[PDB]
Design a protein around this ligand. Structure first.
Ligand code: DGT
Ligand code: DGT
Ligand code: DGT
Ligand code: DGT
Ligand code: TTP
Ligand code: TTP
Ligand code: NI
Ligand code: NI
Ligand code: NI
Ligand code: NI
Lengths: 451, 445, 439, 455
C-alpha cells in the first residue's frame, strides 16, 4: 500500500453494473466511479435516449445514462485489447499509449453529458447545443464533473473536452469516441435495437473487437474482419430507415416543436395574461439562460409543464399539450422536392386553414436529412469520414473500395421529404367538400402535384 | 353500421415489443383503449419504481407492461379457442365470447397505479386497485366512455373481473392467480430490462400446457417442469431484483422526502413556495380522480428539482439524495426484540453527528413489499390437471417447489446514512462502524 | 358417421421444437401422417448442405428439419393471409383458405426427391431431384402417395402440380417457389443458424408483416421495401460467404472424382474386385428403381468410402481417404476459360511428375454452376420479379425503387477456380519448389 | 526449427461455431489433432444419439462438441494466465506450462466414443474412456504420432488427464468436475440445437469469476448466482431433453435391434447373411482398435436398411421401427418390487397379441443414463463446486444456495415400462376385433401416463 495519486486510484474490488446490452459495465477507477455518481451524469437517467421514438417503438424507454455507461464499457474493452496486443512497448511510437486510458475513459463516459430533454427539438427552439454544453460542463468549476476532473490534474478538464471537440493530439483517442465506427455508434446501434425490439438490425461487437487496431492515423480494422465491419454498416443503415426516420415519431416531434414554440410566443406576448407556471423554462423563453438553469431540465420537466397547460386560456397551446401527452401525432405524406411541391403545399395549407387549423402550428415540412444521423460518405479530404481496413502488410484500404455491399449502401444515399398535417383532414358537416378535396391530393402516401 | 362490440379490425395492428416481439391488436375497442388518455399516461410511470437505481436498464413503463399482459392474455385465449373450446369440452372448455372482456381487463389491470405506487400509497393513502375500478366506472374518463360504448353494463363487468367477482373463474384466473398473464409478463419484462435474465423461463412452454376447466385455469401434468421453471424464475427475480437493498434505500429516501414535503406544506412557519400545484390536493388530503390522473413520475422529480434550493436543510438534502442517487445504506438484523437496544443506540450516534434519525434512519423488511411468495385469497394456487381431468396440487408432486416454498429468508434491515461508514466526530464513526460487519448488525448493547 | 380425411383436424395441435422457428405447428392429420411417412423420415439421414460442414462444422442439419421449416413458414403465411387478406374481404386479390392443405403438403414435400449430396450426385449418375419428388408423390408404391391418395384420388397429382408450378393458383405456387418464398427464407435462416453466420439472418416477422396475396400471386407492401432489402442483403451474404466457399467446393470435387472413379472401375471390364457398393450398382449402370434410390443417404456412401480405402486401386483408396479424413484440394482464381487454357495444362503435367493424375486431382469450377441463383429481374418473366404493392393495388418491381437491390443485382458475382492438391505447396525438394507464382 | 510443443501457427485459425461464435487455434499441435483421422470421424457420430427423434434440430456431431470443449478450455487458460498466473498467486496460481496438455485433453476427451455410445456399450461391452486412452496411447493412430512427436512421455500424460490421474488438479478439474468445460459446452450446445433456448446459463459470467487454487478450480463468491444458473440449466436440460421418454423409446428399439442381430449371428441354425462385416468383430466379442474406429452412425443405419429385408420377423421390424421412427410407448411406475408381477402380466398380454416381450418391452430408469446429478459429498473433494470467499476460504455451493440445495435435494430418477403403441390404440374407426379384449384389458392398466396397480 502506497501514496496513490487520484488519477491511478483503483477500487479494492471491481464494481459491476448489470446492463442488458453488454451484460456488465466494469468499473476499476475511482475517478470513473466518482464521475458516474456525479450530479450531471446522474441527470441523464431522466432524459430518454430516443426522444419521441418511444411513441412508435414503445420499448424505447432507455436513458442517456445507460448509453453513456455503455459507451464507456465498449471504450474500456478497446483500451484493454490495445494495451494487451498493440502497446507502445511492443510497437513503438505509434502503438497504444496506456497513459491515455483514463482520459479516453472519461471522454467516453461524458461525451453526451450536455444533452437536454428531446435535445434535437429543444435546440431548434431554444438555440442550445448539446456539444457546446458538454464542453461547458466538463470545464466549468461549478459542476461536480469539473471538480472531479480537476482533481486528476489542473489541465485535465481542458484535455477531456479537447477529446470531445476532436482537438486532442492523439487520433487513437479521438477516433475511439468519434469516427465512422466508434464506441458511441456501436453502443447506440446495439442498445437502440435491443430496446425497440429490432434485434436483426444488429452486428457482432466481439468480432469487431477482435479486429480493431491502433495506428499512426488513428483506428483501423484488420482485413480479415471486413465482413463484421460490413454487418455494422448494415445495422447502421437498417436502424436509420426503420427506426430513427419513422414518420410517426417525427409526427410527435413536430407536435413537440410547435408546442414549445407556442409556449414561448405566449410568454413573450403582453396581451397574454395567464401564468404558464413553467419556472424552469422561463430563462429559455427569455433566451437568457445559465448552465445551472440548463442542468435542471430533463424530460419530466417538459411533460409536467404540458400537463399544467392543458387548462390554459389558449386553445392552440391547450390542444398541442394534449396531443403530446396523449399521442395524437400529425399525419404525413411524402413529396419529391421543395421547389416542385411549393404550390401544392401552399394550397393544402389554405384548405387546412379554412377548416379551422392554423397552418403554422398544424403543418410542417420535414426531412430526415435534418436529423442527427449521418450516412457513411467516405471522403479522402476528411480522414475521419473513412473506415480503414488494415492489410497484413500494414497498408490501409477504405472499406467501400473493397466491399460492394457497403458501396451499395453508401450509394443508396438518400434522405426523405415530408409534409405534416392533422389526421382529422383524412378521417371521415359543412366541411365535407374541404376534406374530400384534401384527400384527393394524397395518393399512395404521397402528395399529388396537380397545382 | 356495425356494432362497436363486434368491431374487429380488418387488418391486424401490431406494436413491436422487445419482450413479446409483437403486441397484436385485432379489435377496435382494444386499440381505442390503448389510445385513451388514462392508458397513455402509463408511459410516464416506471414499472419498477426505484429499481432503475440498481439496474439502470429498468426504465420500462407500466404502459409497456400493460400491453404485455394484454398480449400474453390474447395468446392464451387463442390457444384456448383452438384446442380447448366449449364446442369440444363443454363445461370444462373455453367460451371465446369472453375474449373481449378478458382482454379489456388485462389491458386495464394496472391503470390506477400512480407514480412510485408503493411509496405513494404509504404517504398519501391512495389505493391503486380502487382507483383502477374508479377509472373504469367513472363517466369522466375516456376508458369509461369506450367501455360504455360497448354496452351500458360493460364498465361494471370489466371491473368485476379485476375485483375477482366476475362469474367466470376462467376469466378471473387468467388475469389474477399464482401463474397469470400479469406475473408472467413482469417476470419476463423485468428480467429483460434489468438484464438479470434469471427471470427468463420459457413462456411458449407454459402456453403449451395451460388449460381451462370448470373452476378456472390449470396446467397439464406433463407441463410440471415448465411450471417449476416459472417458480424458479420468480424465486430468482425476488431474491436478486425485487428485494434488493440499494433500491429499497432509494425508496426510504423517497418516502422520507415526500413526508418532509407534506410537513413543510403544513408548517405555519414555512414561507417558501413549493411550486408543487399538482401535489397540493394530496398534501391537503382532499383530491379528485382528475387530480390523481395528472400525476406521474416526472411530476415528482420536477418538483424535487425545484425543492433542492428550499430553505429547509432536510428537504433540500432529501431531494438531492433522490435526484443524485445517494441512498441510505443498510445492515441486516434477526430479531425486533434483541436488536432493539442496539438500534436505539445507533440512532443516538447518528443523531450525535447531526442526522435526524426520523429522516435518516428506517426499519425495513421485505415482508412489507408489494410482491409476495408462493405458499399453498379464495383460490390463488397452482393446479396440475391429469389426463383424466382430476387436479393435483403442484407442491404435492414437486419437491423443488415444496423446498422453495419454505424458503423465505426475507430479511430485516436498519437503514442509515453512508456517511456513517465514510473533524473530531471520528470517534463516533468508529463506534458506529464496530456495530456493523459484512452488511450485518453486531449486537453489543 | 365419420370425418373425411381431408378435414381431419387434430383435437390438440402437435408441436415440434425447432431451434430456428421455435415451434413447428401441426394441426392437420394429413400433415402428421406425411411427416411420419417413410420417405419424409429418410430426409433425417441426408444433410441439407452436403459438403459445407467441412468448412462450417455446425452445418450438420438435415433436409428433414429444412422441410419442416418450409412447411412452418408456409403455415404462418397462410394464417396471416386468412386473418387479414382473405377472399372474404378482397375477393380476387385475396387468399382462399381452401388451398391451405394442398399448399402445406407441397411445402412439406418440395424436397422429398433429394438424394445424398444432391448436386454432385446428379452430375455423375444423371439423377433429377425435381423428377424424383414428383415420382414419390405420384407412385402407388410410396407411403407419401398412399396418404395423399386417401385425401382424394386427384390429390397426389394436384400436390405435384404445385411443385412443378403448373397448379392454377399463382398464390399457392409462389408461396413455395418464387424469388422470396418459404423455401428460400427457411434455408437462408437455417443455414445461417447452423453455420453460425448469425447475420445472413433477416427479420422473418417483418417479411410476414408485409407479405400480400394478389390475383397474380404473392407481392409485398411498399412500406416493407426495407424488410425485403434486408432479405436481399442476407441472401447476398450467404452466397458470398457460405454457399460459394472454396474449401467446401474443394471437398465437392473430391467426392465427384471419387464416385466418378468408382463408376469407371465398375464399367472397366478388366480389373475384378468387390466394391461392396450394393446400393450404388444400379446407379453405375444408369438403370435404377425408385426403391433403390430411396435407400440412398449420406451414411450409405460414407460406409462404402470406408471400405473403398482398401480397394487395390490406389486412386480410389486415396480419394476415399481424402473425403473421409478432410483432405481437400486447394484452388486459385482466374478470369477466362479460353485465355487460361495454356496455364492449366502446364501445372497438370507438373503434378503428374509428382505421381498423381490430373484427371482426378484437378478440375474447373465456377460459382455459377451451383444450385443457387442471384436475383436477376426481367421485363418479360413474372417469376423473377419481386413485386411491391402500393396502397392503390399497383405493382412496382423491387429494383426500380431500391438502388441497393439494383447495385447488388448488377454486381455479377461469378467465380472461376482451378483445383489442385495441397501437396504442391511445400521424391525430393527439386520437383515442387517451383511455380507457386500465383499469389 | 522451433520445437513442436512450441510451434505456433503463422496466423490464428478461426473456425465458425454457432455456439461460441469462433473456435481459435494457435498451436500446430492442436491444428494437427483436429485434422487427425480419429478426431475427424467424430463428424460422423451424433452427439445426442436418439435425441434427434424428439428434438429434430439435435443433429450436431461429437466433432463440434469436441472443438467447443477445446475452445472453452482455451478461454479459461487465457483468463487463468493473465489474471491468476503462478507469478502472482504462487501456489494457488495457474502454471501456463500446463496449457498445451490441457488443450489436448480437452480436444480428445470424447475421441473414444463410437456410434450411439450408451446403447453400443450395453450390447457390445465397449468402454469409451478405455478406448479414448487406447487412441491416445496406441502407436497405430494418427493422434498418438502427433502427441508422441510433442515428446515421448506426452501421450501417457494426455491420457492421465482424462483418467483423472494427472497430478495437477487445476488441469484435471477444467476437463472433468461438477462444472467443467465438457459440461459447459454440451449444455449450451445441446440447448442451442434442440431449441430449448431458455435452458441456458451465461458462459461469460462464469468465465469472469472462475479461478484456480491449490486444490483445483473455484469460483469467486460474487459470481454465485451465475454458478446457480449453471445448475438450473443443467437440471432443466436433464428433465426436458436427456430424459425424454420418446427419445428413450427409440433407444430401446435400437438396443433390442442390435441385440437381435447379435443373437441371430450366434445361432448355428440361422445361416442367413446379415451383411454387416464391420459389426462382425463386435458380434464375436473380439475386436481391434482399427475395427472400432471404422464405426460411425452411417455404418449402423446402412446395415439396418439391409436388415429390413432379412428373413427374421423381429429383426426386420425393429430395423423398420428405427429407420421409420416408431418408438415404443411407455408408462411410469414408482416401485419395481410392487409393480413386478403386474409388468409380467402386461408382458403376457403383449405376447398374446404377437409381440415377443423380450424385444417389444423394456424397463429403464433415467439413473441408467450418462448424466449425473449434483450431489456434493462434504468429504469428497471432486463432487463439489467450490466458491471462494474474500478471505480465500472455500465454501461449497449448496451450502450458501437454497435453490441449489432444493434442486440437489430433488435429484431423482424415474422408472419406465416400454411397450408397443399399438397396445393402446385401435386404428381410426375401430374394426380390428380379433384381440380387442386383450387391448382393452391392457389399456385398463395405463392411466395418466402411469401404470395403475389394481386394489
Ligand atoms: N396507436 C398507437 N400506436 C402505437 C403506440 N405505441 C406504439 N405504436 C406503434 C403501432 C402503430 O402501428 C405504429 C404507428 O402509430 P399510429 O397507429 O399512430 O400510426 P398509423 O399511421 O399506423 O395510424 P393508423 O394506422 O391510421 O392508426 O406505432 C400507441 O400507444 N398507440
Ligand atoms: N454507485 C452506483 N451504482 C449503480 C448505479 N447504477 C446502478 N448501480 C448498481 C451497481 C451495483 O450493482 C449497485 C451498487 O450500488 P452502490 O454503489 O450505491 O452500493 P454499494 O454499497 O454496493 O457500493 P458502495 O459500497 O456504496 O460503493 O448499484 C449508479 O449510478 N451508481
Ligand atoms: N483444417 C480444418 N479446417 C476446418 C475444419 N472444420 C472447419 N474448418 C474451417 C476453418 C476455416 O474457416 C476453413 C479453412 O479450412 P482449411 O484449413 O482446410 O483451408 P485453408 O485454405 O485455410 O488451408 P490452410 O490451412 O491455409 O492450408 O475451414 C477442420 O476439421 N479442419
Ligand atoms: N411424430 C413425430 N414427432 C416428432 C418428430 N420429430 C420430432 N418430434 C417431436 C414432436 C412430438 O410431439 C414429440 C413426441 O413424439 P411422438 O409424437 O412420437 O410421441 P407422442 O407421445 O407425442 O405420441 P402422440 O402422437 O401424442 O400419441 O417428438 C417426427 O418425425 N415425428
Ligand atoms: C416501419 C417499421 C415498424 N416497426 C414497428 C414499429 C411499430 O411499433 C410497429 C408498427 O409500425 P408501422 O409503421 O405501423 O408498420 P406496419 O406495417 O406494422 O403497419 P402500418 O404502417 O400500416 O400502421 O412495427 C418495425 O419494427 N420495423 C419497421 O421497419
Ligand atoms: C417435454 C418437452 C418437449 N419439448 C419439445 C420436444 C418436442 O419436439 C416437442 C413436443 O413435445 P412432447 O413431448 O410431444 O410434449 P407436448 O406437450 O408438446 O405434447 P404431447 O405430450 O401430447 O406429445 O416439444 C420441449 O421443448 N421441452 C419439453 O420440456
Ligand atoms: Ni452517444
Ligand atoms: Ni401488472
Ligand atoms: Ni428447400
Ligand atoms: Ni464431452
Amino acid at each position: 500500500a502506497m501514496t496513490i495519486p487520484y488519477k491511478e486510484q483503483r477500487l479494492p474490488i471491481e464494481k459491476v453494473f448489470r446492463d442488458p446490452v453488454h451484460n456488465y459495465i466494469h468499473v476499476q477507477h475511482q475517478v470513473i466511479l466518482d464521475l458516474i455518481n456525479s450530479a450531471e451524469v446522474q441527470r441523464l437517467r431522466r432524459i430518454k435516449q430516443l426522444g419521441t421514438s418511444s411513441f412508435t417503438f414503445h420499448g424505447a424507454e432507455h436513458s442517456r445514462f445507460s448509453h453513456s455507461l455503455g459507451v464507456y464499457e465498449i471504450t474500456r474493452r478497446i483500451c484493454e485489447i490495445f494495451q494487451r496486443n498493440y502497446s507502445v512497448e511492443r510497437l513503438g511510437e505509434n502503438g497504444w499509449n496506456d497513459d491515455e486510458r483514463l482520459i479516453t475513459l472519461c471522454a467516453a463516459l461524458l461525451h453526451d453529458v450536455g444533452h437536454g430533454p428531446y435535445s434535437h427539438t429543444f435546440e431548434h427552439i431554444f438555440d442550445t447545443n448539446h456539444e457546446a454544453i458538454t464542453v461547458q460542463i466538463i470545464t466549468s468549476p461549478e459542476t461536480e464533473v469539473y471538480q472531479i476532473l480537476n482533481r486528476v490534474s489542473a489541465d485535465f478538464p481542458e484535455k477531456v473536452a479537447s477529446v470531445i471537440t476532436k482537438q486532442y493530439p492523439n487520433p487513437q483517442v479521438v477516433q475511439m469516441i468519434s469516427s465512422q465506427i466508434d464506441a458511441d455508434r456501436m453502443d447506440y446501434l446495439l442498445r437502440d435495437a435491443y430496446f425497440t425490439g429490432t434485434e436483426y438490425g444488429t452486428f457482432d461487437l466481439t468480432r469487431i473487437l477482435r479486429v480493431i487496431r491502433p495506428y499512426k492515423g488513428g483506428i483501423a480494422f484488420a482485413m480479415n474482419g471486413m465482413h463484421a465491419v460490413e454487418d455494422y454498416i448494415v445495422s447502421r443503415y437498417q436502424m436509420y430507415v426503420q427506426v430513427y426516420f419513422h414518420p410517426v415519431s417525427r409526427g410527435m416531434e413536430v407536435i413537440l416543436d410547435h408546442l414549445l414554440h407556442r409556449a414561448k410566443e405566449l410568454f413573450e406576448n403582453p396581451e397574454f395574461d395567464y401564468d404558464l407556471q413553467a419556472s424552469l423554462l422561463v430563462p429559455f423563453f427569455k433566451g437568457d439562460f445559465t448552465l445551472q438553469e440548463y442542468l435542471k431540465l430533463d424530460d419530466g420537466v417538459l411533460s409536467t409543464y404540458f400537463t399544467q397547460w392543458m387548462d390554459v386560456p389558449d386553445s392552440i397551446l391547450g390542444d398541442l399539450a394534449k396531443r403530446f401527452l396523449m399521442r395524437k401525432p400529425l399525419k404525413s405524406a411524402t413529396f419529391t422536392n421543395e421547389k416542385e411541391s411549393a404550390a401544392t403545399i401552399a394550397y393544402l395549407r389554405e384548405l387546412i386553414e379554412k377548416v379551422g387549423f392554423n397552418p403554422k402550428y398544424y403543418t410542417a415540412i420535414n426531412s430526415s436529412y435534418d436529423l442527427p444521423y449521418d450516412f457513411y460518405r467516405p471522403n479522402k479530404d476528411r480522414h475521419r469520414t473513412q473506415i480503414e481496413l488494415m492489410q497484413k502488410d500494414g497498408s490501409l484500404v477504405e472499406l467501400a473500395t473493397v466491399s460492394p455491399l457497403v458501396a451499395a449502401l453508401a450509394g443508396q444515399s438518400q434522405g426523405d421529404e415530408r409534409f405534416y398535417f392533422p389526421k382529422e383532414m383524412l378521417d371521415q358537416d359543412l366541411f365535407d367538400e374541404t376534406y374530400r378535396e384534401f384527400s384527393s391530393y394524397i395518393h399512395n402516401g404521397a402528395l399529388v402535384l396537380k397545382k
